[PDB]
Design a protein around this nucleic acid. Structure first.
Ligand SMILES: [Mg+2]
Ligand SMILES: [Mg+2]
Ligand SMILES: [Mg+2]
Ligand SMILES: [Mg+2]
Ligand SMILES: [Mg+2]
Ligand SMILES: [Mg+2]
Lengths: 367, 367
DNA sequence: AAGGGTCCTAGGACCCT
DNA sequence: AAGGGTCCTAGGACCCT
C-alpha cells in the first residue's frame, strides 16, 4: 500500500539546453528570451538578480552583461524533454510527465525487488543518497525508512544516468506520494536530491508560506481562498469543510484540503506519447487583417512536420485567438480525405477564424 | 476498400419483450406505457391506429381494448438488448450498438472468408436471402453484388439465431455503409431483411421525404435547413457548400451533405461495455422540496446495484434536473474512499443538488 | 410528468519553461 | 506581444424505445 515516488526536476531547463549546445555560455550569465520575457536563466544570471518571467528590460538593468538567446522555438527543449522521459522509462516504464522538465516515477516495485535481493545483514548497511529532509534521523528498523532510502539510491542512479547519457543535471525528491515528492525535490535546488521521511511530512507542508505553493492550488483558487481568510497551510487544514465545498465545489474543496495535509493518493500516470501538438505566436495587436492567414501557415507547417514525425494522425484541429483588451477557440474534425495538405487545412482554419494578440493551432485526437 | 455492413433492428422491441414474458399478450393489441406516453406498441395495436410516442389518452380512444403494461423500468429491455449484441458479437466481434434495439456489424471480413471457401462454380449459385431493394436485378459477375448477397445470407443467419436463441424477431439491412444499411433495413419492416445493391443507392436516399429522415440530421439541424429553404434530399445535395458551412459549421455542413448523397465512411465501432449508467424519473412539478432527496435515493439504489453487477467502478457522478417552465447538471469525482455506500453518495448529490420536473443520476468514467 | 444512450464543443482549472 | 502542456465541466447535438 505504501508507495515510493520520485520527482525529477531539471535545473534551469531551457538555459541548460542552450549552455550545452554553445559551451561558451557556461560561466556567463545566460537568459533565454521569449518576446519581452526572460522565461528562465542559468545560475550565473540568478546570482546577479535575474529571475524567471522578468521583462528583458528589468533583466538587462540588473545584469547588462546578460547574454540572451531566443527560446521561442521549443523544438530543441521538447526533444531533450523526451530523451529524459525515455531514459527514466528504462528504470520503470510508468513515468508521468509534468511540463517539459519534470517527471514522476513510481519506484515502489523497483524498491521492493531490490530489497528482496538483499539479505538480513546488508539491510543494516542501506544508506541514503543525497539529503534527508529536515536532517531527520534514519531508523534502519523502520521498513518505510529503508524503502525510501532505496528510493533515494535509484534517484541518484537516474540523475547520474541523465548526466552521463544526456549531459543534463537536475534535482530529485523521494517521498511517499507525488505532492510530497515534488515539494521535497526543490529543497536543495541546484543539482541535488532530497528524501522525505514520513515523520517530517508536517514540517514540509508547514514550511510553505502561501497556499499557492501547493501544486494543485493555483492563481484563481488562491484568490478565492484568501477571500475566505485562508492564507496559510494550517488555515486551509483547519478551515470548515462544509463552507469550503459550498464556496469552491465538492471536487476542489475536498482535494485541496487533502493536499493541505500532504495527502495525495493520485497514481503516477504513464504519460506516453503526447495527446496534442500545438504552436503559438503572440504579437502586440499586430494582427487586424484576414491576412492573419499568413501567421496560420507557419504554425501549420511546423505542426504538419511534427505530425509526420510522430507517425500518428490527428482527427481534430483547433484554432485559438486572443483579442486585444481570456481566449477564444473553434475546433472541428479533420476530413478523412485529408487525414491520408497545406491548402485544405488553411481553408478549414480560416473558416474557423472567420466564425470568430495571439494565434495558435492545435492538432489533438491522435490515432 | 468496399465494406459489407449489416444493420439489425428489432421489431417493436419493448412490446416484443413484454409479449414474450406474458404470452397472453400476443394477438392482443399491446402498448408499453411510460408516464402519459405509449412509447411503443405491438403490430396488433399498430393496425388499430396506435402509434409510438402517443399520449395514453389518444391511444385508448383509438383502441379502448388496448392492453398497457408499464415499461418505465428498462432493466429487462436493457438485459435482452445485451443478449442480442452478445449473440451478434459471436458472428463478428466488432458490433456497434445504437440505442437498445439496433446493432451494426461489419461483415466484410466474414464475407471475404466465405467467398474464399467457394470454388468457381458455386459462385454462380450464390443467392440472396430476403428482399433486394427496389427489386433490382442481380449480376453474379459483379463482385460487389456477390459480396452483398453473402452479407444477406449472414444477416438471415443472425436473425435466425436471434429467434432460435432469444425468441426475438427483427429486421436487417445489408449495404456498403452504416447510413445505407440502416436506411434499407426498414424498407420491409416486420421481421424481414433487405439488401441494397449499389445501383439503387440514389433511389434509396431520394425515397425519403423530409431531410430529418437521414440519421445524423435531427430536430435542430432540420429546422435550420428549412430556414435556408432546404427541404428535400436533393435540395441538401445541391445546396451551396460554402453557405452551409457558414450557417452550420464546417463539421456539420460537410458530413450531412455527404450523408445526403448516401456517403458515410464512418467505421463500425465496437461499443463493448457501456460508458455510463443512469436512472431517471420525471414528474409534473411534483418536486419543490429538498425532500427531492427521497427521489435521489431510489435512483442511486438502482444504479448502485447496476454498478456492482457490471463489476467495474465509476469515478464520476452527475446529477441532472429539469426545472419547470433544457436541462441543468452538476458532476464531480467519486471520492476514492467510496470507490472501494448509500449515505456518502447521497450527501455528494444533495450538495450538487443545492448548487442548483425531472431528476436523474449518472455514473460515468468506469474503470 | 419517457428513459435512456453516444460523442463533440468551448471554456476553464491546473502544471511547467 | 511566452509557449507550451494536462484533465474536467456543462452543455448541446445526435440516436433509440
Ligand atoms: Mg521544474
Ligand atoms: Mg526546473
Ligand atoms: Mg500552486
Ligand atoms: Mg429501432
Ligand atoms: Mg425497432
Ligand atoms: Mg434524423
Amino acid at each position: 500500500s505504501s508507495r515510493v515516488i520520485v520527482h525529477v526536476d531539471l535545473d534551469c531547463f531551457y538555459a541548460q539546453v542552450e549552455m550545452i549546445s554553445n559551451p561558451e555560455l557556461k560561466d556567463k550569465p545566460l537568459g533565454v528570451q521569449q518576446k519581452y520575457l526572460v522565461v528562465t536563466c542559468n545560475y550565473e544570471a540568478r546570482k546577479l538578480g535575474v529571475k524567471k518571467l522578468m521583462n528583458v528590460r528589468d533583466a538587462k538593468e540588473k545584469c547588462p552583461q546578460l547574454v540572451l538567446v531566443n527560446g521561442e522555438d521549443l523544438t530543441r527543449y521538447r526533444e531533450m524533454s523526451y530523451k529524459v522521459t525515455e531514459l527514466l522509462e528504462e528504470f520503470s516504464p510508468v513515468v508521468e510527465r509534468l511540463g517539459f522538465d519534470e517527471n514522476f516515477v513510481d519506484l515502489t516495485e523497483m524498491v521492493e525487488k531490490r530489497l528482496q535481493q538483499l539479505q538480513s545483514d546488508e539491510l543494516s548497511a542501506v544508506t541514503v543518497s543525497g539529503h534527508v529532509y529536515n536532517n531527520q534521523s534514519i531508523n534502519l528498523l523502520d521498513v518505510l525508512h529503508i524503502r525510501l532510502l532505496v528510493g533515494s539510491q535509484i534517484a541518484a542512479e537516474m540523475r547520474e544516468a541523465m548526466y552521463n547519457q544526456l549531459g543534463l543535471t537536475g534535482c530529485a525528491g523521494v517521498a511517499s506520494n507525488k505532492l510530497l515528492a515534488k515539494l521535497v525535490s526543490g529543497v536543495f535546488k541546484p543539482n541535488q536530491q532530497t528524501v522525505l521521511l514520513p515523520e517530517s511530512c508536517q514540517h514540509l507542508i508547514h514550511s510553505l508560506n502561501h497556499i499557492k505553493e501547493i501544486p494543485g492550488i493555483g492563481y484563481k483558487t488562491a484568490k478565492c481562498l484568501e477571500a475566505l481568510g485562508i492564507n496559510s497551510v494550517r488555515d486551509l487544514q483547519t478551515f470548515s469543510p462544509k463552507i469550503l465545498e459550498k464556496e469552491l465545489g465538492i471536487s476542489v474543496a475536498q482535494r485541496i484540503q487533502k493536499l493541505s495535509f500532504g495527502e495525495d493518493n493520485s497514481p503516477v500516470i504513464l504519460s506516453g506519447p503526447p495527446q496534442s501538438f500545438s504552436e503559438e505566436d503572440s504579437f502586440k495587436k499586430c494582427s487586424s487583417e484576414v491576412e492573419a492567414k499568413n501567421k496560420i501557415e507557419e504554425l501549420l507547417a511546423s505542426l504538419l512536420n511534427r505530425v509526420c514525425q510522430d507517425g500518428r494522425k490527428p482527427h481534430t484541429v483547433r484554432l485559438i485567438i486572443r483579442r486585444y483588451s481570456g481566449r477564444e477557440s473553434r475546433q472541428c474534425p479533420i476530413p478523412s480525405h485529408v487525414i491520408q495538405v497545406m491548402t485544405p487545412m488553411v481553408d478549414i482554419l480560416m473558416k474557423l477564424f472567420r466564425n470568430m494578440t495571439l494565434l495558435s493551432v492545435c492538432f489533438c485526437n491522435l490515432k
